[PDB]
Amino acid sequence: RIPTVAPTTNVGTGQSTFSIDNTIKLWLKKDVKNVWENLVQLDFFTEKSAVGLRDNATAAFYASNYQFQGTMIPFDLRSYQMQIILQELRRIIPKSNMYYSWTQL
């Protein structure tokens, strides 16, 4: 939705009039994982179904002996469920933010 002007000509032998068009640093897969860990530990997310804290140290210990398998599934497949739903999300992000028009679908 940006006019995306990328003219090529200029003053003779100018080499000016660059063609910058994307103008938003779309971050790579290799870096986002940082933000993903930051989030998942800020508790905006959660595992699919995770018993947070067992009743007592007995059931907690009996669940720590459990050799989990989500270990085996890689980082980028653990199906995280949500903690703050999109509707609420629209109500808090101040509209000044340039992504506000995506909170609402």
Binding site: P7, N10, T17
Partner: protein
């Protein structure tokens, strides 16, 4: 060149970068409003011009074909539009009304227009010569 109204250069680029003036631009703008008075009125006279040329044919549009004396306004207008004005040079309805008013005013001798309840009925044609008054642009 011959009035081929192309502009192949003005769309080149943001070449408008040489004049690195001071707030002097306000200076220019201080005169802008002034010309806005003339410019507007100038544009106005343009219709006083434009409509003019149109009527140069209209006293041969209704004349050379229509000798029904009681002709009204809506019918005659809707005749003017959709007449040869569907060729290269179109025109709008209320503009045709203006053309009629102008013809009457520049020739009240024959063309007598007087309105009854809605729409100004027009006179009974008597076929003068015209350009002799068309020179009064």
């Amino acid at each position: 060149n011959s009035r081929y109204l192309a502009n192949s250069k003005e769309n080149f680029m943001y070449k408008e970068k040489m004049p690195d003036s001071q707030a002097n631009l306000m200076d220019r703008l201080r005169e802008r409003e002034r010309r806005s008075a003339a410019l507007l009125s100038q544009r106005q006279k343009r219709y006083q011009q434009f409509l003019a040329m149109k009527m140069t044919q209209v006293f041969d549009i209704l004349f050379s074909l229509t000798r029904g004396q009681p002709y009204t306004e809506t019918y005659l207008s809707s005749l003017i539009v959709d007449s040869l004005q569907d060729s290269n040079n179109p025109i709008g309805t209320k503009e045709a009304s203006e053309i009629l008013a102008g013809l009457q005013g520049i020739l009240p001798m024959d063309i007598s227009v007087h309105q009854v309840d809605g729409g100004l009925k027009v006179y009974r044609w008597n076929s003068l010569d015209k350009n002799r008054f068309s020179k009064l642009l």
